[PDB]
Enzyme design. Structure first.
Site, short mmCIF file in Angstrom:
data_model
loop_
_atom_site.label_atom_id
_atom_site.label_comp_id
_atom_site.label_asym_id
_atom_site.label_seq_id
_atom_site.Cartn_x
_atom_site.Cartn_y
_atom_site.Cartn_z
N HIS F 61 0.83 -1.21 0.00
CA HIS F 61 0.00 0.00 0.00
C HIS F 61 0.86 1.26 0.00
N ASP F 91 10.83 22.24 -24.66
CA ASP F 91 10.67 20.91 -24.09
C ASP F 91 11.56 20.88 -22.87
N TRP F 126 7.13 -0.37 4.79
CA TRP F 126 7.79 0.25 3.62
C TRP F 126 9.21 0.73 3.97
N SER F 156 14.93 6.28 -11.82
CA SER F 156 13.95 7.06 -12.57
C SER F 156 13.88 8.49 -12.05
N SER F 157 13.78 8.63 -10.72
CA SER F 157 13.63 9.95 -10.11
C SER F 157 14.94 10.73 -10.07
N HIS F 240 12.98 11.24 5.49
CA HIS F 240 12.38 12.54 5.81
C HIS F 240 12.39 13.47 4.60
N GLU F 242 12.11 12.64 1.68
CA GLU F 242 11.05 12.10 0.82
C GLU F 242 9.67 12.67 1.14
N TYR F 244 9.00 15.59 2.26
CA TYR F 244 8.93 16.94 1.70
C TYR F 244 8.89 16.90 0.17
N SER F 255 -0.48 26.93 -4.44
CA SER F 255 -0.23 28.35 -4.75
C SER F 255 -0.90 28.78 -6.05
N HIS F 290 14.08 12.00 14.09
CA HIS F 290 12.78 11.99 14.74
C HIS F 290 11.97 10.76 14.36
N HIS F 291 12.49 9.93 13.44
CA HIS F 291 11.91 8.61 13.20
C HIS F 291 12.53 7.57 14.10
N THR F 316 6.72 26.83 7.16
CA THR F 316 5.48 26.27 6.66
C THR F 316 4.33 27.18 7.01
N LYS F 319 3.84 29.87 4.55
CA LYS F 319 3.07 29.50 3.35
C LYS F 319 1.57 29.47 3.64
N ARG F 438 0.99 0.33 15.47
CA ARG F 438 1.03 0.18 14.02
C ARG F 438 1.26 -1.26 13.60
C1 HEA Z 1 3.46 14.78 3.02
C2 HEA Z 1 4.06 14.03 3.94
C3 HEA Z 1 4.52 14.54 5.26
C4 HEA Z 1 4.78 15.80 5.71
C5 HEA Z 1 4.70 17.12 4.86
C6 HEA Z 1 5.16 15.70 7.06
C7 HEA Z 1 5.46 16.84 7.87
C8 HEA Z 1 5.88 16.79 9.26
N1 HEA Z 1 6.04 15.63 10.01
FE1 HEA Z 1 5.70 13.79 9.35
N2 HEA Z 1 5.47 11.90 8.67
C9 HEA Z 1 5.11 11.47 7.42
C10 HEA Z 1 4.69 12.31 6.33
C11 HEA Z 1 4.80 13.71 6.43
N3 HEA Z 1 5.16 14.42 7.50
C12 HEA Z 1 5.14 10.08 7.33
C13 HEA Z 1 4.80 9.22 6.15
C14 HEA Z 1 5.56 9.62 8.55
C15 HEA Z 1 5.75 8.18 8.99
C16 HEA Z 1 6.92 7.43 8.38
C17 HEA Z 1 6.71 5.99 8.80
O1 HEA Z 1 7.15 5.64 9.95
O2 HEA Z 1 6.18 5.18 8.02
C18 HEA Z 1 5.76 10.75 9.33
C19 HEA Z 1 6.31 10.65 10.66
C20 HEA Z 1 6.71 11.79 11.41
C21 HEA Z 1 7.35 11.70 12.66
C22 HEA Z 1 7.80 10.42 13.33
C23 HEA Z 1 6.80 10.03 14.41
C24 HEA Z 1 7.07 8.59 14.88
O3 HEA Z 1 7.26 7.68 14.02
O4 HEA Z 1 6.99 8.36 16.12
C25 HEA Z 1 7.53 13.01 13.09
C26 HEA Z 1 8.22 13.40 14.33
O5 HEA Z 1 8.69 14.51 14.51
C27 HEA Z 1 6.98 13.85 12.07
C28 HEA Z 1 6.88 15.28 12.27
C29 HEA Z 1 6.44 16.10 11.20
C30 HEA Z 1 6.54 17.49 11.27
C31 HEA Z 1 6.94 18.42 12.39
C32 HEA Z 1 6.19 17.93 10.01
C33 HEA Z 1 6.17 19.41 9.67
O6 HEA Z 1 6.70 19.53 8.27
C34 HEA Z 1 4.75 20.04 9.64
C35 HEA Z 1 4.82 21.61 9.57
C36 HEA Z 1 3.40 22.18 9.39
C37 HEA Z 1 2.70 22.84 10.36
C38 HEA Z 1 3.23 23.03 11.77
C39 HEA Z 1 1.30 23.32 9.94
C40 HEA Z 1 1.27 24.75 9.32
C41 HEA Z 1 1.86 25.80 10.23
C42 HEA Z 1 1.20 26.87 10.82
C43 HEA Z 1 -0.28 27.14 10.58
C44 HEA Z 1 2.11 27.77 11.65
C45 HEA Z 1 1.86 27.83 13.16
C46 HEA Z 1 2.22 26.45 13.72
C47 HEA Z 1 2.88 26.30 14.88
C48 HEA Z 1 3.34 27.47 15.71
C49 HEA Z 1 3.21 24.93 15.40
N4 HEA Z 1 6.49 13.10 11.08
C1 HEA Z 2 0.56 8.91 -0.45
C2 HEA Z 2 0.50 8.07 0.62
C3 HEA Z 2 -0.71 7.41 1.15
C4 HEA Z 2 -2.05 7.55 0.88
C5 HEA Z 2 -2.71 8.49 -0.15
C6 HEA Z 2 -2.70 6.64 1.72
C7 HEA Z 2 -4.13 6.49 1.72
C8 HEA Z 2 -4.84 5.59 2.60
N1 HEA Z 2 -4.23 4.81 3.55
FE1 HEA Z 2 -2.27 4.63 3.95
N2 HEA Z 2 -0.32 4.47 4.36
C9 HEA Z 2 0.73 5.09 3.79
C10 HEA Z 2 0.65 6.03 2.67
C11 HEA Z 2 -0.62 6.42 2.19
N3 HEA Z 2 -1.85 5.98 2.54
C12 HEA Z 2 1.96 4.76 4.34
C13 HEA Z 2 3.34 5.30 3.94
C14 HEA Z 2 1.67 3.86 5.38
C15 HEA Z 2 2.68 3.18 6.38
C16 HEA Z 2 3.11 1.79 5.83
C17 HEA Z 2 3.97 0.95 6.83
O1 HEA Z 2 3.48 0.97 7.98
O2 HEA Z 2 5.01 0.39 6.40
C18 HEA Z 2 0.26 3.76 5.37
C19 HEA Z 2 -0.39 2.97 6.39
C20 HEA Z 2 -1.82 2.93 6.45
C21 HEA Z 2 -2.48 2.25 7.46
C22 HEA Z 2 -1.86 1.60 8.73
C23 HEA Z 2 -1.62 0.12 8.48
C24 HEA Z 2 -0.98 -0.37 9.81
O3 HEA Z 2 -0.28 0.30 10.62
O4 HEA Z 2 -1.29 -1.57 10.07
C25 HEA Z 2 -3.81 2.39 7.17
C26 HEA Z 2 -4.93 1.87 7.97
O5 HEA Z 2 -6.06 2.34 8.00
C27 HEA Z 2 -3.92 3.12 5.97
C28 HEA Z 2 -5.17 3.35 5.28
C29 HEA Z 2 -5.30 4.22 4.13
C30 HEA Z 2 -6.56 4.51 3.56
C31 HEA Z 2 -7.90 3.92 4.05
C32 HEA Z 2 -6.28 5.44 2.59
C33 HEA Z 2 -7.28 6.12 1.65
O6 HEA Z 2 -7.43 7.49 2.13
C34 HEA Z 2 -7.01 5.97 0.16
C35 HEA Z 2 -8.22 6.59 -0.63
C36 HEA Z 2 -7.93 6.69 -2.08
C37 HEA Z 2 -7.24 7.70 -2.60
C38 HEA Z 2 -6.67 8.77 -1.72
C39 HEA Z 2 -7.12 7.64 -4.11
C40 HEA Z 2 -5.69 7.61 -4.54
C41 HEA Z 2 -5.68 7.72 -6.06
C42 HEA Z 2 -5.46 8.80 -6.82
C43 HEA Z 2 -5.18 10.15 -6.23
C44 HEA Z 2 -5.51 8.56 -8.31
C45 HEA Z 2 -6.19 9.80 -8.87
C46 HEA Z 2 -6.41 9.70 -10.35
C47 HEA Z 2 -6.06 10.71 -11.16
C48 HEA Z 2 -5.39 11.99 -10.70
C49 HEA Z 2 -6.36 10.54 -12.61
N4 HEA Z 2 -2.69 3.42 5.54
O1 LIG Z 3 8.66 12.35 7.88
O2 LIG Z 3 7.76 13.40 8.59
CU LIG Z 4 10.40 12.76 9.13
#
Ligand code: HEA
Ligand code: HEA
Ligand SMILES: [O-][O-]
Ligand SMILES: [Cu+2]
Ligand SMILES: CCCCCCCCCCCCCCCCCC(=O)OC[C@H](COP(=O)([O-])OCC(O)COP(=O)([O-])OC[C@@H](COC(=O)CCCCCCCCCCCCCCCCC)OC(=O)CCCCCCCCCCCCCCCCC)OC(=O)CCCCCCCCCCCCCCCCC
Ligand SMILES: CCCCCCCCCCCCCCCCCC(=O)OCC(COC(=O)CCCCCCCCCCCCCCCCC)OC(=O)CCCCCCCCCCCCCCCCC
Ligand SMILES: CCCCC/C=C\C/C=C\C/C=C\C/C=C\CCCC(=O)O[C@H](COC(=O)CCCCCCCCCCCCCCCCC)COP(=O)(O)OCCN
Ligand SMILES: CCCCC/C=C/C/C=C\CCCCCCCC(=O)O[C@H](COC(=O)CCCCCCCCCCCCCCC)COP(=O)(O)OCC[N+](C)(C)C
Ligand SMILES: CCCCCC/C=C\CCCCCCCCCC(=O)O[C@H](COC(=O)CCCCCCCCCCCCCCC)COP(=O)(O)OC[C@@H](O)CO
Ligand SMILES: CCCCCC/C=C\CCCCCCCCCC(=O)O[C@H](COC(=O)CCCCCCCCCCCCCCC)COP(=O)(O)OC[C@@H](O)CO
Ligand SMILES: CCCCCC/C=C\CCCCCCCCCC(=O)O[C@H](COC(=O)CCCCCCCCCCCCCCC)COP(=O)(O)OC[C@@H](O)CO
Ligand SMILES: CCCCCCCCCCO[C@@H]1O[C@H](CO)[C@@H](O[C@H]2O[C@H](CO)[C@@H](O)[C@H](O)[C@H]2O)[C@H](O)[C@H]1O
Ligand SMILES: C[C@H](CCC(=O)O)[C@H]1CC[C@H]2[C@@H]3[C@H](O)C[C@@H]4C[C@H](O)CC[C@]4(C)[C@H]3C[C@H](O)[C@]12C
Ligand SMILES: C[C@H](CCC(=O)O)[C@H]1CC[C@H]2[C@@H]3[C@H](O)C[C@@H]4C[C@H](O)CC[C@]4(C)[C@H]3C[C@H](O)[C@]12C
Ligand code: CUA
Ligand SMILES: [Mg+2]
Ligand code: NA
Ligand SMILES: [Zn+2]
Lengths: 227, 94, 84, 58, 259, 514, 105, 48
Positions: F61, F91, F126, F156-157, F240, F242, F244, F255, F290-291, F316, F319, F438
């Site tokens: 997934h 292009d 993953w 690819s990327s 991490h 990734e 972003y 935007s 932080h992971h 952030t 923005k 999890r």
């Molecule tokens: C699009 C994907 C995405 C993004 C953008 C982020 C953004 C952030 N993530 Fe996230 N994160 C994931 C995807 C993402 N993360 C995923 C996939 C994991 C799990 C990986 C895994 O284990 O599988 C994860 C796990 C993860 C962890 C690990 C937790 C754990 O495993 O125990 C942490 C810990 O610090 C973290 C922190 C944050 C923080 C601080 C941001 C910051 O960038 C957010 C900043 C944004 C704001 C704060 C909101 C807007 C701000 C305002 C309106 C300003 C005012 C706000 C304040 C004064 C606070 N993330």
């Molecule tokens: C981009 C990342 C992404 C997205 C979109 C999703 C979407 C969803 N995810 Fe997932 N998820 C992960 C990335 C994502 N997830 C990751 C990284 C993990 C951790 C894995 C690990 O633990 O190793 C995770 C783990 C995770 C778990 C925890 C499993 C566990 O700990 O046992 C669960 C459980 O409910 C869950 C559920 C869902 C569901 C119900 C949705 C739904 O919201 C999905 C609904 C459908 C969509 C959002 C459509 C997507 C399709 C398009 C956008 C195509 C559009 C077409 C055109 C533009 C033409 N996800």
């Molecule tokens: O990775 O947040």
């Molecule tokens: Cu991170």
């Protein structure tokens, strides 16, 4: 343990977990406030036919919304880090206990004095005694003295696991070749439950942790009887 | 030591590379390598926009350091004005 | 540093050829002498079946599964010791 | 060696509509066919191998 | 007809054959590691070499023979090669991080020391020092080759580029001999793992870089390069300096400091 | 002609179309896997099997959604279509290498599918941590096929990153500086820098896992003096950056969408937006551990990673406030794309804020490896990255196709998806705070109510996905051809018509210096 | 940046240019409505008389519509502006959108 | 009246409350009576 429809943290069983609850309350208030402010401002921007589409100068307002978040972050970091270093402080334990993760159960070693060790497996659902909790009970609980500082050392003899007890605020990864330390102090007698917290294969969901906190004299006699 | 035997670009450049080289030597820019310099942009002194067809897209940076560029098609005929700053542009097809 | 050499005026082909033949290749020649001069086999040490060495968690995809890719019978013991 | 770049330039600039990967002559087509046949045949073979590996083999 | 200076490339099959060669090489390695067979892998390596040969052949046709490399196109290729080298640096950085992680904190299984108990490192003053002098020398001779080309001197370009290649080959042969002579192996715990995977990928890059220099040598023999336009030579020289600098970091880190 | 055009392409628009089709197909795969997860969890007990089959599904997934759906759609799809048009370029810099970035992805996906068909699949997460992913606890070909899948996606990327950076630096009009390029173009450039630096480190780590599995190295095996935690560092040094990479092109599209449907000629605070994306990109490289707050790291390292992670809220926040300031005073057009973008601003903010909760290492001890993390990242991925993808898709579909969507159906679609994703993920905060781990196929009974609700949410999102397919069909079925598009003076990618000709900017734009 | 009075005077001068052309009329009105204000009657008066010099009755009506639009929910602004303009409306024979039925949806 | 695809590069008409005076007239072609109406518009609008 968790109870049905629970919204927040399990009640604290240790002073550190109490500290975390208050720190979470503080941080969640900020989270609520900022989320709600953003939602409100969105609705404010979208609810007027008045317009202003010419170029807008940004310099003044970017000061506000850099300095205000910086201040808020500092207001989170200060209590956050205080608790961090508190959890790290030297405490002088009275007892050391080791736990080794395995696929899929925990073993425990209490070797300060005698060589006491045993395995701790989930009770199968078909063998629960009436009123016992599905996926949480074990055959041999981790009996420990209440109101005493305990050093837990955690490792693994195969893949990664992670030894957790949410109501004590504990989660220490179980890594082969590594001996990780945490400290445990329960303010109360009772039974406190946790679950393996690093994916470890086919029965990751089914290797729980049960601590049984009792007075020292009971712990001593239990220890002797487990030799 | 020394000696020759390596061709020069004058001798051996070909195709578009050679066209660009020969035009640069004549001071010409048929392949749009340089930024054109603006006139005063009045209706009397419009920016003159070369084209090999009868319309070309203009981007107008109305003021120095604007990050927004204003884009529009300039067509053969009477000079047109940037919709943001009014600066004049006239197509010169060739 | 300025190294200890000296020229420029113009860095050019002539200078870099000068460096190639006057410094770089003489240095290679010197190191070639030094090396082919300290060659001559070392005594292979007693074999000790240390558990952190001669690792085998999966047979190698060649040979009998138990020989490394550039196995040298003289100096590379197998997990059971030196062969033949 | 003598400099024959001019004659290569004439050859690869000939107005014959050929894409650059075929513009050298019949040798290009042969090498292209060999490459593409190996790629597509090898890809079919990899799919057979997946078919084979997807099932238990006593 | 265009009035910009950029290159619209003819539709090409090599991207697809390259992608398929990647499928065949990776599924081939899987078949080799798990199903005792080299067949897919040999097909993949063959189609990979065919793809690279025809793709870069076409780039030469497009530039030397058709004139599509205007200055703007060359400038893009310069950025492309610099960015490629940067990604290669970061790839090596992962292996250096692995090396320092393990050697700075040697675990009990090693004896709690570095080098581990039972490991007898090569003497860094013997062949490793010789290979350092060899790659440094090749960095001097490739600079002579570059200046000879810019000054229009065909014979000394060829001489210097030939000396550079010879040194590249010398390094590879020395390294092959040192691999055979080494008393430790890739299976000798983390010392062998880091040593052979890091120097092994480095040796692969020396072979790649030597091949690229050899391509430049034969293009130069065929008069492809002008005294001012010779990006393939510049790219091969940048890549060659990158291979030299990675070696210097390996020598200091793994052979010397890690001994 | 069909093969020449679609298998041998050197055209940025057609290759963008290929990426959009590939990502849409991947999105169906990823959605099916997500429904299998939630079916397993939708009632207590065991549906499919034990945690191995369950975590093969979870692992796939994530890989599918990240590497085959979001990155191909945002970077390969919108990036290839829009970046050359937005800078007037004819292009990409390397149009033929661009085609290979695309064609590496079907093989990468085939390798992932093969991994799940052979043996018992790769049930690793993953993150693919050893020793579970090593050759004793995951013997056989599945994990190696996963590694090779990642290698191909990584190549690819990386080559795509080289292409985008070179194109954006080198192929703008000579008068246009970097501070006159649109924010989406900036977002792609910065994402490409992150890809270029981070993916080679992942490649190094997974290659070390491959040799530990097959060549008897011991990078991660204590028996040889290796360390499982070294793998975690190398992985998260990529992982991490990734996330972003997953959001930054989304920020760029948000935007453009907010600016356009506010009736504005420009986003509020352009240089602040550039600064914020660069700052986020830079800070995203110095926070990876932080992971790893429960692995046993020293307290001062935990304090550093807590603090450095929290700082990213400041750029952030600039923005988010600047998007709100772009809305301010707008002539708001309540288009479906605008609805996606408004939902983005709010729900991304919520998920960013729970990420700030998690950045606190003391609290993360209790939240780590629980569903509170799952809730955080699905707010930013399922309601951030995906909402930006949907907004951009509905906004630019008429440019790419020449046809209009039915806006009423598109608003219905948004409404259903918005309910579905919030019902899915909001209760997962409760499950996390109360301790549900999890990667579990079943849970103690107390957790039943929120798992039931969450699974019901996932079915609502399924209905939205099915409806999206019908909506795309209806547009192509009805053939309403675009006539006029407003605001072309500040949206150059529309100025060549809908769809633009195969070759655009054969004559470059005229931009003078003044 | 300037005083309100200076702003309004610049805009009156802009529209009062005798040989103002159609492009400049449109540029002026489309720029003006981007600001956070409803234009003062004296500005609208000059724009309407520019319409008259350009023989463009329709744009004069449109300008009255955009005054009403810029007021948003402040329903008191537009009738005030029309009241202030009635001598000019009568002198130039400009019918309001309401008089023409163009306020009907 | 009728907008054509091949017209995309020409100034176009839009109804937008924030762009009150679009770049072109809605109707460019005039009948005999519409021509007479545009002539009459050059005289006092009170007489319309
Ligand atoms: C699009 C994907 C995405 C993004 C953008 C982020 C953004 C952030 N993530 Fe996230 N994160 C994931 C995807 C993402 N993360 C995923 C996939 C994991 C799990 C990986 C895994 O284990 O599988 C994860 C796990 C993860 C962890 C690990 C937790 C754990 O495993 O125990 C942490 C810990 O610090 C973290 C922190 C944050 C923080 C601080 C941001 C910051 O960038 C957010 C900043 C944004 C704001 C704060 C909101 C807007 C701000 C305002 C309106 C300003 C005012 C706000 C304040 C004064 C606070 N993330
Ligand atoms: C981009 C990342 C992404 C997205 C979109 C999703 C979407 C969803 N995810 Fe997932 N998820 C992960 C990335 C994502 N997830 C990751 C990284 C993990 C951790 C894995 C690990 O633990 O190793 C995770 C783990 C995770 C778990 C925890 C499993 C566990 O700990 O046992 C669960 C459980 O409910 C869950 C559920 C869902 C569901 C119900 C949705 C739904 O919201 C999905 C609904 C459908 C969509 C959002 C459509 C997507 C399709 C398009 C956008 C195509 C559009 C077409 C055109 C533009 C033409 N996800
Ligand atoms: O990775 O947040
Ligand atoms: Cu991170
Ligand atoms: C099987 C593989 C097939 C390869 C294609 C063969 C096509 C033959 C067609 C002949 C007509 C014009 O000038 C040309 C010059 C060609 C130079 C080829 C150099 C070959 C590699 C030699 C490597 C040795 C390196 C080692 C250093 C250490 C040595 C240790 C002993 C024209 O010609 C331009 C074509 C060449 C440009 C692209 C070259 C890319 C080369 C790489 C593909 C092969 C990779 C091998 C690398 C791996 C290690 C061996 C005509 C030339 C034909 C021969 C090409 C051989 C290439 C290999
Ligand atoms: C995005 C809310 C429930 C609550 O009282 O949560 C409390 C805490 C734990 O608190 C406690 O320990 C004491 C609990 C008190 C018990 C009282 C009984 C409450 C009744 C049951 C509630 C039913 C839940 C609904 C179930 C919901 C199912 C979907 O849990 C939590 O932190 C959950 C963590 C959520 C963090 C994300 C913040 C998002 C904010 C968005 C709102 C902005 C505007 C809203 C307006 C949003 C409009 C769009
Ligand atoms: C200059 C002389 C040496 C030059 C280089 C020679 C070989 C280089 C080949 C590729 C190097 C790349 C790394 C491969 C890993 C190991 C090779 C390490 C170098 C080497 O050759 O190591 C040898 C072992 O090779 C072995 O296991 C097996 C070797 C063959 C198996 C290769 C398996 C495939 C590797 C996967 C590559 C993945 C790449 C992904 C890149 C992605 C980037 C985005 C050491 O021999 P030994 O007998 O153990 O000890 C010597 C005892 N006398
Ligand atoms: C958690 C931190 C919260 C920070 C919130 C900051 C809000 C600042 C609001 C007031 C600024 C006035 C006059 C020239 C034209 C107008 C230019 C600026 C327009 C006003 C800014 C738009 C703000 C929209 C709300 C953003 C919060
Ligand atoms: C800031 C970067 C600092 C880098 C080096 C720190 C070295 C600290 C050790 C000091 C000597 C004792 C030990 C640290 O191990 C280790 O490998 C550290 C290995 C390096 C990891 C560096 C992370 C950056 C990687 C990309 C560049 C435990
Ligand atoms: C695995 C097997 C690897 C095998 C070995 C591969 C060795 C590489 C050979 C590359 C040959 C490229 C020849 C084409 C060339 O050099 O093309 C030049 C353009 O450069 C260009 O594309 C530069 C393009 C090439 C960059 C190549 C860099 C090496 C890539 C190797 C693969 C990396 C593997 C990493 C493994 C971890 C042509 O322009 P000029 O020279 O200016 O000529 C024009 C003048 O004549 C006009 O007067
Ligand atoms: C486990 C085993 C996994 C194996 C996976 C292998 C996967 C891939 C198979 C590779 C097949 C490669 C075939 C040759 C490709 C040559 C690309 C090239 O040379 O691309 C050039 C641009 O890239 C440039 O310069 C600079 C960039 C050059 C890159 C050359 C190829 C690199 C491929 C490997 C990259 C690995 C990255 C490693 C670092 C982590 C030219 O761009 P084009 O658009 O073509 O032309 C533009 C025209 O104007 C030229 O006249
Ligand atoms: C496209 C994805 C491919 C996944 C690749 C998995 C590896 C398959 C190699 C196995 O090939 C098979 O090996 C058998 C025993 O040696 C025999 C059989 O004849 C052969 O075909
Ligand atoms: C100087 C630079 C570019 C200005 C320009 O050339 O247009 C601007 C653009 C974004 C600005 C920054 C952002 O607005 C965010 C911060 C805002 C604070 O008010 C000052 C520091 C702050 C970090 C600003 C410093 C500086 O003015 C920046 C970095
Ligand atoms: C996590 C990484 C070690 C990775 C490894 O074990 O392989 C180490 C190496 C260098 C360390 C950093 C350097 O020691 C410098 C800082 C020291 C402070 O006490 C904590 C933050 C601090 C910024 C460290 C954080 C973290 O422990 C780092 C980055
Ligand atoms: Cu043990 Cu999970
Ligand atoms: Mg964990
Ligand atoms: Na279940
Ligand atoms: Zn302008």
């Amino acid at each position: 343990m968790a109870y049905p429809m629970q919204l927040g943290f399990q009640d604290a069983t240790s002073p550190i977990m109490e500290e975390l609850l208050h720190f979470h309350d503080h941080t969640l208030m900020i989270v609520f406030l900022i989320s709600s402010l953003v939602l409100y401002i969105i609705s404010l921007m979208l609810t007027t036919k008045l317009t202003h589409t010419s170029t807008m100068d940004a310099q003044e307002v970017e000061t506000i919304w850099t300095i205000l978040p910086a201040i808020i972050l500092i207001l989170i970091a200060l209590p956050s880090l205080r608790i961090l270093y508190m959890m790290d402080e030297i405490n002088n334990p009275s007892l050391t206990v080791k736990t080794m993760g395995h696929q899929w159960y925990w073993s425990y070693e209490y070797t300060d004095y005698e060589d006491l060790s045993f395995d701790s497996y989930m009770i199968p659902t078909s063998e629960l005694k009436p009123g016992e909790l599905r996926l949480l009970e074990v055959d041999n609980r981790v009996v420990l003295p209440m109101e005493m500082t305990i050093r837990m050392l955690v490792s693994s003899e195969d893949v990664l696991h992670s030894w957790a007890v949410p109501s004590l605020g504990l989660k220490t990864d179980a890594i082969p070749g590594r001996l990780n330390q945490t400290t445990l102090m329960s303010s109360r007698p009772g039974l406190y439950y946790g679950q393996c917290s690093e994916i470890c294969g086919s029965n990751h969901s089914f290797m729980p942790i049960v601590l049984e906190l009792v007075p020292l004299k009971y712990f001593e006699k239990w220890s002797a009887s487990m030799l | 030591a020394s000696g020759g035997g390596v061709p020069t670009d004058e001798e051996q450049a070909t195709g578009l590379e050679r066209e660009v080289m020969l035009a640069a030597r004549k001071g010409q820019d048929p392949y749009n390598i340089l930024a054109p310099k603006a006139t005063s942009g009045t209706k009397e002194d419009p920016n003159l926009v070369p084209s090999i067809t009868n319309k070309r897209i203009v981007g107008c940076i109305c003021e120095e350091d604007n990050s927004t560029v204003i884009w529009f098609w300039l067509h053969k005929g009477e000079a047109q004005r940037c919709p943001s700053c009014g600066t004049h542009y006239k197509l010169v097809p060739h | 540093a300025s190294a200890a050499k000296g020229d420029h005026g113009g860095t050019g082909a002539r200078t870099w050829r000068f460096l190639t033949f006057g410094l770089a290749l003489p240095s290679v020649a010197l190191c070639t002498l030094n090396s082919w001069l300290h060659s001559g086999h070392r005594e292979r040490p007693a074999f000790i079946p240390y558990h952190h060495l001669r690792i085998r968690t999966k047979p190698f995809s060649w040979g009998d599964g138990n020989h490394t890719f550039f196995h040298n019978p003289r100096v590379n013991p197998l997990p059971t010791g030196y062969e033949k | 060696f003598e400099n024959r770049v001019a004659e290569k330039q004439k050859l690869f600039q000939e107005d014959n509509g050929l894409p650059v990967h075929l513009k050298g002559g019949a040798t290009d087509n042969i090498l292209y066919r060999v490459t593409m046949t190996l790629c597509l045949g090898g890809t079919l073979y990899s799919l057979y191998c997946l078919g084979w590996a997807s099932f238990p083999h006593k | 007809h265009q009035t910009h200076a950029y290159h619209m490339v003819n539709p090409s099959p090599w991207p697809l054959t390259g992608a398929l060669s990647a499928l065949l090489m990776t599924s081939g390695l899987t078949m080799w590691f798990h199903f005792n067979s080299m067949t897919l892998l040999m097909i993949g390596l063959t189609t990979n070499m065919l793809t690279m040969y025809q793709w870069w052949r076409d780039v030469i046709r497009e530039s030397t023979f058709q004139g599509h490399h205007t200055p703007a196109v060359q400038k893009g290729l310069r950025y492309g090669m610099i960015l490629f080298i940067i990604s290669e640096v970061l790839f090596f950085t992962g292996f250096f991080w692995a090396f320092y992680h393990s050697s700075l904190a040697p675990t009990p299984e090693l004896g709690g020391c570095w080098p581990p108990t039972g490991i007898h490192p090569l003497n860094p003053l013997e062949v490793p020092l010789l290979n350092t002098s060899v790659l440094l020398a090749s960095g001097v001779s490739i600079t002579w080759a570059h200046h000879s080309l810019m000054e229009g001197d065909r014979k000394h370009m060829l001489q210097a580029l030939f000396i550079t290649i010879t040194l590249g080959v010398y390094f590879t042969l020395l390294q092959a001999s040192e691999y055979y002579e080494a008393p430790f192996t890739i299976s000798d715990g983390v010392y062998g793992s880091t040593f052979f995977v890091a120097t092994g990928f480095h040796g692969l890059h020396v072979i790649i870089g030597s091949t690229f220099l050899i391509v430049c040598f034969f293009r130069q023999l065929k008069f492809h390069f002008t005294s001012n336009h010779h990006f393939g030579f510049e790219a091969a020289a940048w890549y060659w300096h990158f291979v030299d600098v990675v070696w210097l970091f390996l020598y200091v880190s793994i052979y010397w400091w890690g001994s | 002609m069909f093969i020449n055009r679609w298998l041998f392409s050197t055209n940025h628009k057609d290759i963008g179309t290929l990426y959009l089709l590939f990502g849409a197909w991947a999105g169906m795969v990823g959605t099916a896997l997500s429904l299998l997860i939630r079916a397993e969890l939708g009632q207590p007990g065991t549906l499919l099997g034990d945690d191995q089959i369950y975590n093969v599904v979870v692992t796939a997934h994530a890989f599918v959604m990240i590497f085959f759906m979001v990155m191909p759609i945002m970077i390969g799809g919108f990036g290839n279509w829009l970046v050359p048009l937005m800078i007037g370029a004819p292009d990409m810099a390397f149009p033929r290498m661009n085609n290979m970035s695309f064609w590496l992805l079907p093989p990468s996906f085939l390798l992932l599918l093969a991994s799940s068909m052979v043996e018992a699949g790769a049930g690793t997460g993953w993150t693919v941590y050893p020793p579970l992913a090593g050759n004793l606890a995951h013997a056989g070909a599945s994990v190696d096929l996963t590694i090779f899948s990642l290698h191909l996606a990584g190549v690819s990327s990386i080559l795509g990153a080289i292409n985008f950076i070179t194109t954006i630096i080198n192929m703008k009009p000579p008068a246009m500086s970097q501070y006159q390029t649109p924010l989406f173009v900036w977002s792609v450039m910065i994402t490409a820098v992150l890809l270029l630096l981070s993916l080679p480190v992942l490649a190094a780590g997974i290659t070390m896992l491959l040799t530990d599995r097959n060549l008897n190295t011991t990078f991660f095996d204590p028996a040889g003096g290796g360390d499982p935690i070294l793998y975690q560092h190398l992985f998260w040094f990529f992982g991490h950056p990734e996330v972003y990479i997953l959001i930054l092109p989304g920020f760029g599209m948000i935007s453009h969408i907010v600016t356009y449907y506010s009736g504005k000629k420009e986003p509020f605070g352009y240089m602040g937006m550039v600064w914020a994306m660069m700052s986020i990109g830079f800070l995203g490289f110095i926070v990876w551990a932080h992971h790893m707050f429960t692995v046993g790291m020293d307290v001062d390292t935990r304090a550093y990673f807590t603090s450095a992670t929290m700082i990213i809220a400041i750029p952030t926040g600039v923005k988010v406030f600047s998007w709100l300031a772009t809305l301010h005073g707008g002539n708001i057009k309540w288009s479906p794309a605008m609805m996606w973008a408004l939902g983005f601003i709010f729900l991304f903010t919520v998920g960013g804020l729970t990420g700030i909760v998690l950045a606190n290492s003391s609290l993360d001890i209790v939240l780590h490896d629980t569903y509170y993390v799952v809730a955080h990242f699905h707010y930013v991925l399922s309601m951030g990255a995906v909402f930006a993808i949907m907004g951009g898709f509905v906004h630019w579909f008429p440019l790419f196709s020449g046809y209009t969507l039915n806006d009423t159906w598109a608003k219905i679609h948004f409404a259903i998806m918005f309910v579905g994703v919030n019902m899915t993920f909001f209760p997962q905060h409760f499950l996390g705070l109360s301790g549900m781990p999890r990667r579990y196929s079943d849970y103690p009974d107390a957790y039943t109510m929120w798992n039931t609700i969450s699974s019901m949410g996932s079915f609502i999102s399924l209905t939205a996905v099915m409806l999206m397919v019908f909506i795309i069909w209806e547009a192509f079925a009805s053939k309403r051809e675009v006539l006029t598009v407003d605001l072309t003076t500040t949206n150059l990618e529309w100025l060549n018509g809908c769809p633009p000709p195969y070759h655009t900017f054969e004559e470059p734009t005229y931009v003078n210096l003044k | 940046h300037e005083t309100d009075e200076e702003f309004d005077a610049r805009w009156v001068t802009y529209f009062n240019k005798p040989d103002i052309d159609a492009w400049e009329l449109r540029k002026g009105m489309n720029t003006l409505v981007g600001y956070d204000l409803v234009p003062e009657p004296k500005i609208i008066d000059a724009a309407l008389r520019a319409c008259r010099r350009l023989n463009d009755f329709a744009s004069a009506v449109r300008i009255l519509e955009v005054v009403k639009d810029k007021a948003g929910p402040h329903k008191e602004i537009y009738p005030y502006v029309i009241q202030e303009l009635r001598p000019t409306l009568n002198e130039l024979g400009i019918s309001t959108p309401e008089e023409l039925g163009l306020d009907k949806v | 009246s009728v907008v054509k695809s091949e017209d995309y590069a020409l100034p176009s008409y839009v109804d937008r409350r924030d762009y009150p005076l679009p770049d072109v007239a809605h109707v460019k072609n005039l009948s005999a009576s519409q021509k007479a109406l545009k002539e009459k518009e050059k005289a006092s609008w009170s007489s319309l």
